[PDB]
Amino acid sequence: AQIGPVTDLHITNANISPDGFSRPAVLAGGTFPGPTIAGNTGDNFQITVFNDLTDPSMLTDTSIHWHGLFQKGTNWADGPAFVTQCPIITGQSFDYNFNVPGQAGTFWYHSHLSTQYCDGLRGPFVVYDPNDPNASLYDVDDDTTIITLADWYHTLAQQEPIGAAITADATLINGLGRSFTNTTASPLSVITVQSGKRYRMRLVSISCDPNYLFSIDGHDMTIIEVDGVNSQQLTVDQIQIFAAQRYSFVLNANQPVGNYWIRAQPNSGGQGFDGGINSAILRYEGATVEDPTTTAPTTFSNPLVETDLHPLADLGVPGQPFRGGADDPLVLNLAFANGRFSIDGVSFVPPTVPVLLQILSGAQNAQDLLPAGSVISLPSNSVIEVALPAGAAGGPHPFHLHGHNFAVVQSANNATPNYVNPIWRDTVSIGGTGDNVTIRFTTNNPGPWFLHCHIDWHLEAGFAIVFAEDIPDTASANPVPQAWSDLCPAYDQAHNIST
Ligand SMILES: *[C@@H]1O[C@H](CO)[C@@H](O[C@@H]2O[C@H](CO)[C@@H](O)[C@H](O)[C@H]2NC(C)=O)[C@H](O)[C@H]1NC(C)=O
Numbered sequence: 001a002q003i004g005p006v007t008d009l010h011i012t013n014a015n016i017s018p019d020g021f022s023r024p025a026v027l028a029g030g031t032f033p034g035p036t037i038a039g040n041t042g043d044n045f046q047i048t049v050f051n052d053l054t055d056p057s058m059l060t061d062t063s064i065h066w067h068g069l070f071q072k073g074t075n076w077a078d079g080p081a082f083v084t085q086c087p088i089i090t091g092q093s094f095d096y097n098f099n100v101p102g103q104a105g106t107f108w109y110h111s112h113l114s115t116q117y118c119d120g121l122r123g124p125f126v127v128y129d130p131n132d133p134n135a136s137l138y139d140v141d142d143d144t145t146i147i148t149l150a151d152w153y154h155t156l157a158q159q160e161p162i163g164a165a166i167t168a169d170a171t172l173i174n175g176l177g178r179s180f181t182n183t184t185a186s187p188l189s190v191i192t193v194q195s196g197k198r199y200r201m202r203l204v205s206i207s208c209d210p211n212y213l214f215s216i217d218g219h220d221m222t223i224i225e226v227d228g229v230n231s232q233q234l235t236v237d238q239i240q241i242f243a244a245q246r247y248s249f250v251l252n253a254n255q256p257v258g259n260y261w262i263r264a265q266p267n268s269g270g271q272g273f274d275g276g277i278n279s280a281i282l283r284y285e286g287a288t289v290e291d292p293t294t295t296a297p298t299t300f301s302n303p304l305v306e307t308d309l310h311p312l313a314d315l316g317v318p319g320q321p322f323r324g325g326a327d328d329p330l331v332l333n334l335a336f337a338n339g340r341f342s343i344d345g346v347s348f349v350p351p352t353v354p355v356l357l358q359i360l361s362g363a364q365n366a367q368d369l370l371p372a373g374s375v376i377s378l379p380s381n382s383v384i385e386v387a388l389p390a391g392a393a394g395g396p397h398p399f400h401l402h403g404h405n406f407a408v409v410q411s412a413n414n415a416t417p418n419y420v421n422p423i424w425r426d427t428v429s430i431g432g433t434g435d436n437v438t439i440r441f442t443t444n445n446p447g448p449w450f451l452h453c454h455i456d457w458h459l460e461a462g463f464a465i466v467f468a469e470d471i472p473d474t475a476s477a478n479p480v481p482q483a484w485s486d487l488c489p490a491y492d493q494a495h496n497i498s499t
C-alpha cells in the first residue's frame, strides 16, 4: 500500500538480503526501497519522521529530502543537512509539513545526511494529477507500475574512502537482484502485465552513483514525463537514466503472452547478465512461471537522446537566445584533484550552523555565509543561466538543483544549444570532456538551494555549492515552526557542539 499524504515514517536499522548477502541497513518503513509516499497535486503532506536509529556505523542522526519538490515558502522542510536543517537525533521525531502546488509527477525521498541514503533510506514519492493531460494514454498507473533502479553495496557507506571510485555489488530492480561476484540465484523481481493493457511505468533512479542502460526485451517505451515535467510522446527502445532522474513511459503489453527480461546495465560494476545479474522479469498474466529466454539486441536502434525530448506544455526558455543571455549568467569551474571535488575553487564541507539558520539570524550577504566561498547569492525575480562544463574525473556527473526545475539549454555530447523548446528537468548529466551543459531558471523561490552532483560519493567529497536565492526575502518567505527551531539546539547538545 501507498502511504500519505499525512503519515508517520519510522527510520530503523535492520538486516536485509536483497541479493542473498545479509547486511545491516537504514530503512524507511521497514523495507528496501521504502514505502511509496503519495498524494495528489496541491496536497498538504505531513510526513512525521521518527528517528529510531541505534547503529552508529550508519549514523544515528538523519534528515530526509523530498527530491524535486520545490518547497516554496517551506525551505526549512527541504532536508539537506547543514543547508536547511540540523539532523534529527535518535529518539526524536520531526514533522515535514509542506504543500505541492503546481507539481505532479514522479519523485523520490532519501536521506540527505552524509552518504546515509546509500545504506538504504530511499523510496518513491508520487504526486498524481486527477486531471492528468496524459491520462488517456494508458489504463493502469498505481504502486505496481513503479520501477526503482538501485545500486547496492556489501560494505557500509561510512567505510567507503572519501573521493574514491566506489563500486557496487548488485543492481536491484524493485528491491531485488543478484550479486556481481559470488553470484547466487536469489529471487528476481517480477512486474506483471495483462495482454492488451497499457501501463504508466514510473521509472525512478534511486542510485547513489551508477547510471543505467534500461530496456525491456521485445518492448519499446513511450516517454511522457521527465523528472516531473510532462513531455511530448517519445518512443525509444533504451533509456540511459542517471542517478536521481525519473521517467514515466507507456508500456503497451502488445507482445505474445510470455516472459521477457527487464535489463538495467550500470556504467560500473558487473557488466552483462550472466547468472541473471542486472535483471528482472516482465511476466504476462497466463505465462508459465519460468525465467525469460529472450535476447537483447547487439545495439539499440532508438535510444533516448535528451535533445529529442520536448515539454508537453509550451514552457519555452527564459532569457535571450544566446550564451550569457540572462540577468545573472554564471559559469561554474568544476574540478577534482587528490580525492576532493571543488566548485569555483572551493570544496564543500558542511557548516556547523545550517545556511538557512545563518540567514534567519541576520547574515545577509553571501560573503557573510559559511562555508566561505561555498555560497553564491542569486537576485530575486531574475533569469539565471548556469553553464556546467564537464572534464572533472568520475563523470558523467548528474547535477541536481534543489527548489527548482530548469530548462536544459544544452545537453551532453551535443555542442548546439536550444533556446526554443528543450526539456525541463531537475537532474542532468553534464557529459564529457569539452561539453558545456547549461541550465536556465527564474528566481521566484527565496531560500538557500543546494546545487550538487547526485553521485552521493562525490557530494561527500565536496562537489556542491549553495545558491542563496533572494537572501533579503528568505526570512519573510519561510516562517519556521518551533520544532525546526528546536533541531539545532538538540543536535548540538547531543553531539557536544558549541555554536
Ligand atoms: C560554456 O559557455 C560559457 C557561456 O555560457 C562560456 O563562458 C565564457 O567563457 C569565456 C572564457 O572561456 C569568457 O570570456 C566569457 O565571459 C564567458 N561567458 C560568455 C561568452 O557568455 C564557457 O567558455 C563555455 N565553456 C566551454 C568549455 O565551452
Ligand SMILES: *[C@@H]1O[C@H](CO)[C@@H](O[C@@H]2O[C@H](CO)[C@@H](O)[C@H](O)[C@H]2NC(C)=O)[C@H](O)[C@H]1NC(C)=O
Pocket: 305, 307, 308, 414, 415, 416, 417, 418, 419
Ligand atoms: C543537437 O542538439 C540540437 C539542439 O537541441 C538539435 O537540433 C534540433 O534538431 C531538431 C530535430 O531535427 C530541429 O527541429 C531543431 O530546429 C534543432 N534546433 C537547433 C537549435 O538546431 C539536434 O538534433 C541535436 N543533434 C542530434 C544528433 O540529436
Ligand SMILES: [Cu+2]
Pocket: 065, 067, 110, 244, 400, 454
Ligand atoms: Cu536527491
Ligand SMILES: [Cu+2]
Pocket: 065, 066, 067, 068, 400, 401, 402, 403
Ligand atoms: Cu533534491
Ligand SMILES: [Cu+2]
Pocket: 394, 395, 396, 397, 398, 453, 454, 455, 458, 459, 463
Ligand atoms: Cu559526480
Ligand SMILES: [Cu+2]
Pocket: 065, 080, 112, 400, 402, 450, 452
Ligand atoms: Cu540534494
Ligand code: NA
Pocket: 316, 317, 318, 319
Ligand atoms: Na523565451
